[PDB]
């Protein structure tokens, strides 16, 4: 097996190329080895509207079944309804075949080994296994497991909805075309779902919230249609994108302050978790409400770890992930989230445009990207954190760099599944954002003179 489909986060591989049907046989056999290695013979395994899902799906059963594991088969679903299941079913191990938000020919796994979703050296000790036939064999089984009518239930007998309203759904042709609009609807909403047949080609726009040309459809079928309000979905269902009344895209951080005050209102002094890439205005709102703010590392995995260690009632990240504990069991699901978000909207009487306008709002960039390379990228970093100069402000190291200034922040660090270094900036004014900008194009440059800075 290719060293690089073995990510931090966890794995992920075009079909084909850098993943075939005999490698993910190889994956199951040392997932099931490192389950029962922690003493769980059981592991559910969930799949999503893919091409490649069918055929790798079997290979990945039948290695998990090589080791004497007994697995749960849940078929076809959500991201979040296969972690959903390793916290009901017997077993708290889970493998989900899926590749994310990327184009048709990708995919790859995430794994929670023994209620712990696997990263950094986990994640390559699952390599290191294969490589050195460290491998568990036993004679395994495989149960046909119907899970998502219990998953639909638990979420609409949790939820209630003050209110009707009307609702467009873009699932992007991913698989949250399974259950998304048909939830949505119980809750007691109307919905008019856009791209919501399952459809692994993705014949319309990438399955990728995060991207606001993929929003374009959704955007305008709300204004259209005078809907309350947009939702989209990326392949999986684990990251969500809000579109409001009036077209306003809310991005995950802005989204976060809404249910920030949610969750610390029933629960005082509780930990709510951000990634590295969020607003400061999030560590001020949380902190209002009494909540204790804890920023961390980007990725899904390391968000859910820290969340266990925190015991954090909430956690979310800017790409779209976010994690309820409180009411839930503190996976990322995007299906979840938005029914949370209803429940909230709904017990309100302005719109979505003015409940979410109501919170501050500083001058922001998009994520910016800047391609290096695999064997570069983490010493690039390294070497900001050894020898730059940020001038006054809260140096923060945990991931990349980044800078608090009174007046806004700046962020470089590296990505987990590019070869690319990933920034964001934010300010009170174009005067301190430029400022911030200078600062941080000018530690690059004398990092690497070269480095091609685009701000
Ligand atoms: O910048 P990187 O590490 O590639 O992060 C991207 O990768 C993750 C996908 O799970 C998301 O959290 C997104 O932020
Ligand atoms: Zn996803």
Known sequence: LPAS?????????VVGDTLTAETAYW????????????????????????????????????????????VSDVGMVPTPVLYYAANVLEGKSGVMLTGSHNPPDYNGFKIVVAGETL???????????????????????????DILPRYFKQIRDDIAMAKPM????????????????????????????????????????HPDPGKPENLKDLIAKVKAENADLG???????????????????????????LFAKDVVSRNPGADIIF???????????????????????????????????????????????????????????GIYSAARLLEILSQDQRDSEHVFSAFPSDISTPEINITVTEDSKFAIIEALQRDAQWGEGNITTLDGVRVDYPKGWGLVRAS??????????????????????????????????SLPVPF
Not at 319 to 333: A, N, Y
């Open 5 to 13: 489909i073995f990510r931090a986060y966890d794995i992920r591989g």
């Open 231 to 257: 939702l989209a979905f990326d392949g999986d269902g684990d990251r969500v994108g809000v579109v409001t009344n009036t077209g306003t895209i809310i991005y995950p951080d802005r989204l976060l302050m």
């Open 27 to 70: 994956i199951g056999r040392a997932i099931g080895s490192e389950s029962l290695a922690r003493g769980e013979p059981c592991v559910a395994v969930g799949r999503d509207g893919r091409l490649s899902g069918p055929e790798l799906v079997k290979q990945l059963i039948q290695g998990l079944v090589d080791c004497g594991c007994q």
């Open 119 to 145: 990263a950094n050296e986990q994640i390559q000790a699952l390599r290191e296994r294969i490589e050195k036939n460290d491998l568990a064999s036993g004679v395994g089984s495989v149960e046909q497991v």
């Open 166 to 205: 009307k609702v467009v759904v873009d699932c992007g042709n991913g698989v949250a075309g399974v259950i998304a609009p048909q939830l949505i609807e119980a809750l007691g909403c109307s919905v008019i779902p856009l791209y919501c047949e399952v459809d692994g080609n993705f014949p319309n726009h």
């Open 275 to 333: 990634d590295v890439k969020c607003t400061r205005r999030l560590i001020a709102l949380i902190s209002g409400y009494g909540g204790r703010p804890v920023m961390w590392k980007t990725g899904h995995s390391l968000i859910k770890k820290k969340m266990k260690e925190t015991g954090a009632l909430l956690a979310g990240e800017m790409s779209g992930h976010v994690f309820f504990k409180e009411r839930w069991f503190g996976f990322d699901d």
């Open 416 to 449: 987990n599944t590019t070869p690319v270094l990933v920034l964001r900036f934010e300010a009170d004014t174009e005067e301190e954002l430029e400022r911030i900008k200078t600062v941080f194009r000018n530690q690059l440059k004398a990092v690497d003179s």
